[PDB]
Scaffold this motif. Structure first.
Motif, PDB file in Angstrom:
ATOM      1  N   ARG B  50     -16.704  -9.431  11.553  1.00  0.00           N
ATOM      2  CA  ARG B  50     -15.404  -9.300  12.144  1.00  0.00           C
ATOM      3  C   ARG B  50     -14.316  -9.532  11.117  1.00  0.00           C
ATOM      4  O   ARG B  50     -13.166  -9.811  11.470  1.00  0.00           O
ATOM      5  CB  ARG B  50     -15.293 -10.265  13.310  1.00  0.00           C
ATOM      6  CG  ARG B  50     -15.696 -11.727  13.022  1.00  0.00           C
ATOM      7  CD  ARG B  50     -15.659 -12.519  14.360  1.00  0.00           C
ATOM      8  NE  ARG B  50     -14.694 -11.953  15.334  1.00  0.00           N
ATOM      9  CZ  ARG B  50     -13.353 -12.050  15.248  1.00  0.00           C
ATOM     10  NH1 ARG B  50     -12.773 -12.730  14.235  1.00  0.00           N
ATOM     11  NH2 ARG B  50     -12.580 -11.482  16.190  1.00  0.00           N
ATOM     12  N   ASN B  51     -14.695  -9.383   9.846  1.00  0.00           N
ATOM     13  CA  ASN B  51     -13.796  -9.561   8.704  1.00  0.00           C
ATOM     14  C   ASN B  51     -13.899  -8.416   7.687  1.00  0.00           C
ATOM     15  O   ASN B  51     -13.379  -8.516   6.551  1.00  0.00           O
ATOM     16  CB  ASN B  51     -14.131 -10.858   8.007  1.00  0.00           C
ATOM     17  CG  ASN B  51     -13.466 -12.039   8.664  1.00  0.00           C
ATOM     18  OD1 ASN B  51     -13.980 -13.194   8.630  1.00  0.00           O
ATOM     19  ND2 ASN B  51     -12.290 -11.769   9.265  1.00  0.00           N
ATOM     20  N   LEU B  52     -14.599  -7.349   8.093  1.00  0.00           N
ATOM     21  CA  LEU B  52     -14.755  -6.140   7.293  1.00  0.00           C
ATOM     22  C   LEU B  52     -13.448  -5.316   7.232  1.00  0.00           C
ATOM     23  O   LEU B  52     -12.912  -4.936   8.271  1.00  0.00           O
ATOM     24  CB  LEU B  52     -15.847  -5.302   7.935  1.00  0.00           C
ATOM     25  CG  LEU B  52     -17.067  -5.259   7.069  1.00  0.00           C
ATOM     26  CD1 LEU B  52     -18.190  -4.435   7.771  1.00  0.00           C
ATOM     27  CD2 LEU B  52     -16.609  -4.642   5.736  1.00  0.00           C
ATOM     28  N   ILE B  53     -12.934  -5.035   6.029  1.00  0.00           N
ATOM     29  CA  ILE B  53     -11.710  -4.226   5.866  1.00  0.00           C
ATOM     30  C   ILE B  53     -11.855  -3.079   4.864  1.00  0.00           C
ATOM     31  O   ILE B  53     -12.508  -3.190   3.826  1.00  0.00           O
ATOM     32  CB  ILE B  53     -10.495  -5.124   5.486  1.00  0.00           C
ATOM     33  CG1 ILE B  53     -10.108  -5.970   6.700  1.00  0.00           C
ATOM     34  CG2 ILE B  53      -9.270  -4.303   5.063  1.00  0.00           C
ATOM     35  CD1 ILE B  53      -8.810  -6.670   6.599  1.00  0.00           C
ATOM     36  N   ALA B  54     -11.256  -1.953   5.211  1.00  0.00           N
ATOM     37  CA  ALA B  54     -11.271  -0.768   4.372  1.00  0.00           C
ATOM     38  C   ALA B  54      -9.817  -0.601   3.846  1.00  0.00           C
ATOM     39  O   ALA B  54      -8.794  -0.717   4.600  1.00  0.00           O
ATOM     40  CB  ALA B  54     -11.675   0.493   5.233  1.00  0.00           C
ATOM     41  N   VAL B  55      -9.692  -0.301   2.564  1.00  0.00           N
ATOM     42  CA  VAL B  55      -8.365  -0.140   2.064  1.00  0.00           C
ATOM     43  C   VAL B  55      -8.249   1.218   1.447  1.00  0.00           C
ATOM     44  O   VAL B  55      -8.975   1.528   0.500  1.00  0.00           O
ATOM     45  CB  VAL B  55      -8.063  -1.210   0.992  1.00  0.00           C
ATOM     46  CG1 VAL B  55      -6.619  -1.032   0.448  1.00  0.00           C
ATOM     47  CG2 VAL B  55      -8.230  -2.610   1.555  1.00  0.00           C
ATOM     48  N   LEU B  56      -7.355   2.038   1.977  1.00  0.00           N
ATOM     49  CA  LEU B  56      -7.137   3.360   1.411  1.00  0.00           C
ATOM     50  C   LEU B  56      -5.896   3.314   0.497  1.00  0.00           C
ATOM     51  O   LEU B  56      -5.106   2.382   0.578  1.00  0.00           O
ATOM     52  CB  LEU B  56      -6.887   4.360   2.541  1.00  0.00           C
ATOM     53  CG  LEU B  56      -8.150   4.882   3.156  1.00  0.00           C
ATOM     54  CD1 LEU B  56      -9.019   5.493   2.040  1.00  0.00           C
ATOM     55  CD2 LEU B  56      -8.916   3.731   3.808  1.00  0.00           C
ATOM     56  N   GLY B  57      -5.710   4.325  -0.341  1.00  0.00           N
ATOM     57  CA  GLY B  57      -4.538   4.365  -1.198  1.00  0.00           C
ATOM     58  C   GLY B  57      -4.425   3.318  -2.308  1.00  0.00           C
ATOM     59  O   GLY B  57      -3.352   3.186  -2.946  1.00  0.00           O
ATOM     60  N   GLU B  58      -5.527   2.611  -2.571  1.00  0.00           N
ATOM     61  CA  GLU B  58      -5.555   1.550  -3.566  1.00  0.00           C
ATOM     62  C   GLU B  58      -5.739   2.081  -4.985  1.00  0.00           C
ATOM     63  O   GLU B  58      -6.415   3.066  -5.177  1.00  0.00           O
ATOM     64  CB  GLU B  58      -6.688   0.570  -3.196  1.00  0.00           C
ATOM     65  CG  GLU B  58      -6.821  -0.757  -4.018  1.00  0.00           C
ATOM     66  CD  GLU B  58      -5.502  -1.552  -4.154  1.00  0.00           C
ATOM     67  OE1 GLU B  58      -4.712  -1.166  -5.049  1.00  0.00           O
ATOM     68  OE2 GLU B  58      -5.255  -2.536  -3.394  1.00  0.00           O
ATOM     69  N   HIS B  59      -5.150   1.424  -5.970  1.00  0.00           N
ATOM     70  CA  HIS B  59      -5.282   1.878  -7.353  1.00  0.00           C
ATOM     71  C   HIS B  59      -5.527   0.671  -8.283  1.00  0.00           C
ATOM     72  O   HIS B  59      -6.647   0.495  -8.847  1.00  0.00           O
ATOM     73  CB  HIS B  59      -4.009   2.641  -7.776  1.00  0.00           C
ATOM     74  CG  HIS B  59      -3.935   2.916  -9.240  1.00  0.00           C
ATOM     75  ND1 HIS B  59      -4.922   3.603  -9.916  1.00  0.00           N
ATOM     76  CD2 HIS B  59      -3.066   2.483 -10.184  1.00  0.00           C
ATOM     77  CE1 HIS B  59      -4.675   3.571 -11.213  1.00  0.00           C
ATOM     78  NE2 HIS B  59      -3.552   2.896 -11.404  1.00  0.00           N
ATOM     79  N   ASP B  60      -4.468  -0.151  -8.402  1.00  0.00           N
ATOM     80  CA  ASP B  60      -4.416  -1.392  -9.225  1.00  0.00           C
ATOM     81  C   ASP B  60      -4.525  -2.578  -8.260  1.00  0.00           C
ATOM     82  O   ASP B  60      -3.701  -2.750  -7.387  1.00  0.00           O
ATOM     83  CB  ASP B  60      -3.074  -1.446  -9.946  1.00  0.00           C
ATOM     84  CG  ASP B  60      -2.924  -2.641 -10.844  1.00  0.00           C
ATOM     85  OD1 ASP B  60      -3.352  -3.772 -10.469  1.00  0.00           O
ATOM     86  OD2 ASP B  60      -2.349  -2.443 -11.947  1.00  0.00           O
ATOM     87  N   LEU B  61      -5.551  -3.387  -8.441  1.00  0.00           N
ATOM     88  CA  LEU B  61      -5.842  -4.506  -7.553  1.00  0.00           C
ATOM     89  C   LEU B  61      -4.939  -5.731  -7.684  1.00  0.00           C
ATOM     90  O   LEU B  61      -4.992  -6.657  -6.866  1.00  0.00           O
ATOM     91  CB  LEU B  61      -7.308  -4.922  -7.751  1.00  0.00           C
ATOM     92  CG  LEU B  61      -8.307  -3.888  -7.302  1.00  0.00           C
ATOM     93  CD1 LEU B  61      -9.679  -4.388  -7.492  1.00  0.00           C
ATOM     94  CD2 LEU B  61      -8.057  -3.641  -5.840  1.00  0.00           C
ATOM     95  N   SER B  62      -4.093  -5.728  -8.703  1.00  0.00           N
ATOM     96  CA  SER B  62      -3.212  -6.865  -8.949  1.00  0.00           C
ATOM     97  C   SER B  62      -1.768  -6.655  -8.530  1.00  0.00           C
ATOM     98  O   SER B  62      -0.952  -7.539  -8.742  1.00  0.00           O
ATOM     99  CB  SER B  62      -3.237  -7.190 -10.436  1.00  0.00           C
ATOM    100  OG  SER B  62      -2.648  -6.102 -11.109  1.00  0.00           O
TER     101      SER B  62
END
Ligand SMILES: [Ca+2]
Lengths: 56, 248
Positions: B50-62
């Motif tokens: 119940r803590n699974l997340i998908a992130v779209l549009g990501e490039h630089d993690l910082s």
């Protein structure tokens, strides 16, 4: 005709019926040109197209 | 990705970032606005579903630039033939809780049909793999998304070039320990170019260590699963977070 060779000249998907009769198709979000083989986008962000490169 | 380059922001719009409790977990591929293809082994030890997340549009993690998109993973679907802890049938179909909004930075990757992919894509020599995984075996993962162009081998040629590889997989990459995908990249896209359009042909799976000389990368052969994928995508959601669907 049968479209097993060179994808039957289709840009995307094709399928061949009986003999010498074939038909190219496109993934959703696309339409087949009058051309018969080409697919042209029908929505703003068709799958597999990269906007930043597409827009040049 | 070992031996690659940074994917310029926007040129890997279908790449997905899987997070557990906020932590980097896996990569995945966007094939529609609510569907994400990934890899089964990525969920073998999942903490809280119940803590699974998908992130779209990501490039630089910082850095946050406003293009990033976050969605809760609502369901993770795994073929029945998959055996946790192993590697055959390493594929997973994730359903986002809410749709991602397509934009110049969030675009789905075409899932090709079985025939087209087996007799045409399966023969394109070079394809792209990407992810924020390790940059070296036993090294640190990446902050910016990485991409690497790798050559697909014939199952026969793969076996011999190495003195375990089912038909639901295919090898790709290089044996000189210089280029490959690592843990952190699992579940990410193996994408093929054809006639002006990219299509999903492989899922980053396992492989003997990362960039291990004398070894190639193993990727799930997506084509063996199009129909499975499609039947599920056209079905109605059944209760539950983790679901096993029959396969074939
Ligand atoms: Ca960011």
């Amino acid at each position: 005709l049968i479209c097993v060779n060179e994808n039957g000249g289709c840009e995307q998907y094709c399928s061949d019926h009986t003999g010498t009769k074939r038909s190219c198709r496109c993934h959703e979000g696309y339409s087949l040109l009058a051309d018969g083989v080409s697919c042209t986008p029908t929505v703003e962000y068709p799958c597999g197209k990269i906007p930043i490169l597409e827009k040049r | 990705i070992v031996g690659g380059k940074v994917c310029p922001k926007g040129e890997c719009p279908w790449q997905v970032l899987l997070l557990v409790n906020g932590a980097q977990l896996c990569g995945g591929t966007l094939i529609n606005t609510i569907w994400v293809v990934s890899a089964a082994h990525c969920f073998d030890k999942i903490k809280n579903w119940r803590n699974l997340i998908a992130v779209l549009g990501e490039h630089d993690l910082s850095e946050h630039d406003g293009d990033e998109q976050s969605r809760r993973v609502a369901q993770v679907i795994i073929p029945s033939t998959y055996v946790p802890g192993t590697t055959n049938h390493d594929i997973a179909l994730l359903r986002l809780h809410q749709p991602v909004v397509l934009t110049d930075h969030v675009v789905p990757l075409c899932l090709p049909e079985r025939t087209f992919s087996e007799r045409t894509l399966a023969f394109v020599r070079f394809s792209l793999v990407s992810g924020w995984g390790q940059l070296l075996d036993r090294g640190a993962t990446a902050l910016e998304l990485m991409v690497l162009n790798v050559p697909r081998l014939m199952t026969q040629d793969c076996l011999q070039q190495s003195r375990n590889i089912t038909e639901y997989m295919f090898c790709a990459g290089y044996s000189d320990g210089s280029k490959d995908s690592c843990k952190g990249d699992s579940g990410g896209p193996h994408a093929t170019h054809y006639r002006g359009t990219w299509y999903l042909t492989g899922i980053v799976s396992w492989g003997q260590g990362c960039a291990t000389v004398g070894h190639f990368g193993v990727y799930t052969r997506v084509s063996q699963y199009i129909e499975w994928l499609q039947k599920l995508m056209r079905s109605e959601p059944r209760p539950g977070v983790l679901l096993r669907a029959p396969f074939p």
